[PDB]
């Protein structure tokens, strides 16, 4: 129990984690199925007990690295899973290793997920930080006050459309 093992119960072969099940089966019911109709839980033929079957290989794997010409340092991101196997840090996007968490917020360089972005910055290494939404500007508001520009600059903006 509480381990990823290859199980062969009543001729049913598969891989998953066996744990005590909170679901109550009827006396005649033996094989359980999930919403997808795949294997969910079964009853041990010898000692009647319900065991939940959870498929292994939780989440995915992602690689965060800058341009090879800059540096070869990389950070591994595990999606929607906590640090199990494993510079071990956690974030909204899941377990993240190889990146240093920084409270300071900077412009999004390499997206991570859930409002998290990583960048290669200063003796330089990958860092993890909350995505910056732009410089905070508080414009004063008053009924009797207005702002009329005293100077102007004509700028040309480059736009490309296929």
């Amino acid at each position: 129990k509480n381990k990823c093992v290859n199980f062969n119960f009543n001729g049913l072969t598969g891989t998953g984690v066996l744990t005590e099940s909170n679901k109550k089966f009827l006396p005649f019911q033996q094989f359980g199925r999930d919403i997808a109709d795949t294997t969910d839980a079964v009853r041990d033929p010898q000692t009647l007990e319900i065991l939940d079957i959870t498929p292994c290989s939780f989440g995915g794997v992602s690689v965060i690295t800058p341009g090879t010409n800059t540096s070869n340092q990389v950070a591994v991101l595990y999606q929607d899973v906590n640090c199990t196997e494993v510079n071990v840090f956690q974030t909204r996007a899941g377990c993240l290793i190889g990146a240093e968490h920084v409270n300071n917020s900077y412009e999004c360089d390499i997206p991570i997920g859930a409002g998290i972005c990583a960048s290669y910055q200063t003796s330089q290494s990958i860092i993890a930080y909350t995505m910056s939404l732009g410089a905070e500007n508080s414009v004063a508001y008053s009924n009797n006050s207005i702002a009329i520009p005293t100077n102007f600059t004509i700028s040309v903006t480059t736009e490309i459309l296929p």
Partner: protein, 225 residues
């Protein structure tokens, strides 16, 4: 204005010369097309469950009946590859056609005439745009009026001179602490408050925040003459 425009053109030239990622929008299309073509070409090497991925090898090994089954599998695989490639190409072509319609609208409005749409020709108040031929696309040089510096000034929705509220015809009323002057929202150019620059409506007891000031009458010097 000419100096600023020339400086902006030079800056764009330098950025394009140094930073090649500026054309990343077209580079993405080029890379996607190249990747699709390469994948379709490489699928010819896939066995797709057959003994060999080469049609000639199958034809030179098995009998007509077994060769027929093997070639049926190979043709099924290659036809699936072709259908996937054609679907991807159709989706990308629909996206590029939508972008081409957008670019045609951008040209017709920004370049030919003047476009009042916000940010459609780019950030800031648009004046004119200059298209530039690019491979499998086009690059637009959007000229816009962006205010640089601003200074806070005292304002009032109306001026009370003779009990009747006066409202700006165009622009807004501002004051630097000496007198109330008329200027536009987008630029600072004080002007003398006068009837020609305002109109009479309502009264001073209805308008909220109205202030008292003298409105210049152009006929006053002429009548006294």
């Amino acid at each position: 204005i000419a100096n600023q425009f020339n400086s902006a053109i030079g800056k764009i030239q330098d950025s394009l010369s140094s930073t090649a990622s500026a054309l990343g929008k077209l580079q993405d299309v080029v890379n996607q097309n190249a990747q699709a073509l390469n994948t379709l070409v490489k699928q010819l090497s896939s066995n797709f469950g057959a003994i060999s991925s080469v049609l000639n090898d199958i034809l030179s090994r098995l009998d007509p009946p077994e060769a027929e089954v093997q070639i049926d599998r190979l043709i099924t695989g290659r036809l699936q590859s072709l259908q996937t490639y054609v679907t991807q190409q159709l989706i990308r072509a629909a996206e590029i056609r939508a972008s081409a319609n957008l670019a045609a609208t951008k040209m017709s409005e920004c370049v030919l005439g003047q476009s009042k749409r916000v940010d459609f020709c780019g950030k800031g108040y648009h004046l004119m745009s200059f298209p530039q031929s690019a491979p499998h696309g086009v690059v637009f040089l959007h000229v816009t009026y962006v205010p640089a510096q601003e200074k806070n000034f005292t304002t009032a929705p109306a001026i009370c001179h003779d009990g009747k509220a006066h409202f700006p015809r165009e622009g807004v009323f501002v004051s630097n602490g000496t007198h109330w002057f008329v200027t536009q929202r987008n630029f600072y150019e004080p002007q003398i408050i006068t009837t020609d620059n305002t109109f009479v409506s309502g009264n001073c007891d209805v308008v909220i925040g109205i202030v008292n000031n003298t409105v210049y009458d152009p006929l006053q010097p002429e009548l006294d003459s």
